[PDB]
């Protein structure tokens, strides 16, 4: 229970942190380049022929 509380807090902190950094760069007249994604979901959708 307590650890899940902490995890939810961390998720919200990360989201508002990214938003805040973007706004700070916008106000300072620069562009903050988002960090590249580290996880991808891959779904095979084509059958194995040819």
Partner 1 sequence: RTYRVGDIVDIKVNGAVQKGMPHKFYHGKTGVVYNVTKSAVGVIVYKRVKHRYIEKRINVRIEHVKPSRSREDFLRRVKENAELKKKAKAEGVPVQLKRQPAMPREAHTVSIADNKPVTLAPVAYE
Partner 2 sequence: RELIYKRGYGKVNGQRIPLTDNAIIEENLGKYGIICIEDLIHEIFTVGPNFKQAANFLWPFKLSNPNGGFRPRKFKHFIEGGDLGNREEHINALIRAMN
Partner 3 sequence: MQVYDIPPLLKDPSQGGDATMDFLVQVARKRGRLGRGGVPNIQAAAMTVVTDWRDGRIQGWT
Partner RNA sequence: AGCGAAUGAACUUUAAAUAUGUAAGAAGCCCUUGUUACUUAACUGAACGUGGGCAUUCGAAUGUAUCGACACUAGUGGGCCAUUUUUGGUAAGCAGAACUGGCGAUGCGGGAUGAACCGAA
* Interface residues toward partner 3, by CB under 8 A: 2-3, 6-7
Q: Which is nearer to partner 1, 4 or 48 (CB)?
A: 48
C-alpha span between 30 and 21 (Å, rounded): 11
| Candidate list 2, 3, 12, 36; residue touching partner 1; CB under 8 A | 36
Least Cβ distance, residue 33 to partner 2 (angstroms): 15
Q: What is the CA radius of gyration of the chain?
A: 18
Do residues 39 and 31 make contact, with C-beta atoms less than 8 angstroms apart? no
Least Cβ distance, residue 4 to partner 3 (angstroms): 9
């Amino acid at each position: 229970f307590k650890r899940a509380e902490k995890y939810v807090k961390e998720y919200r902190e990360q989201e508002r942190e990214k938003i805040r950094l973007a706004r700070i760069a916008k106000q300072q007249g620069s562009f903050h380049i988002p960090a590249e994604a580290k996880l991808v979901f891959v779904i095979r959708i084509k059958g194995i022929n040819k």
